[PDB]
Amino acid sequence: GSSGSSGFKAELNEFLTRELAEDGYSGVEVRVTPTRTEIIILATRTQNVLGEKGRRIRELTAVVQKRFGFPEGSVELYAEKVATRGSGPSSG
């Protein structure tokens, strides 16, 4: 995905920036498929954003569901970790 017009992603990024302020947020990616919407936060520490056995992600699903009006089973919430472009796998 890439920056530009898209509406939802800007509201959701504004939302999550507050939610995950100290947690280590950066941004989010989104997909919308013939099957569901997908929401993929980008943060320094994915475990904090998940919380204790997925606590925070489950709650953040419900609040997003309420705020944005998502149908259940048709929003999915994921967490990606931040990592630079560049470097190798191992090169040996």
Experimental technique:
NMR
Q: What is the largest CA-CA distance in the chain?
A: 49
Structure tokens at 72: 């259940």
Question: Which CATH number is 77's domain given?
Answer: 3.30.300.20
Q: Is residue 14 part of a domain?
A: yes
- Strand ranges, E, within the chain: 25-32, 37-43, 75-81
Q: Is residue 23 part of a domain?
A: yes
Q: Is residue 88 part of a domain?
A: no
Q: Provide the 10 A C-beta neighbour count for residue 52.
A: 7
Q: Is residue 33 part of a domain?
A: yes
- CB distance 42 to 27 below 8 Å: yes
Q: Is residue 90 part of a domain?
A: no
Domain count, the chain: 1
- CB distance 80 to 29 below 8 Å: yes
Burial of 36 (0-12, 13-18, 19+ CB in 10 A): middle
* Nearest Cα residue to 77 out of 92, 52, 88, 46: 46
Q: Is residue 91 part of a domain?
A: no
Q: Provide the 10 A C-beta neighbour count for residue 3.
A: 8
Q: Please name every residue paired with 43 in a beta bridge, in sequence order, or none if there are none.
A: 25, 81
Domain around 18: 1-82
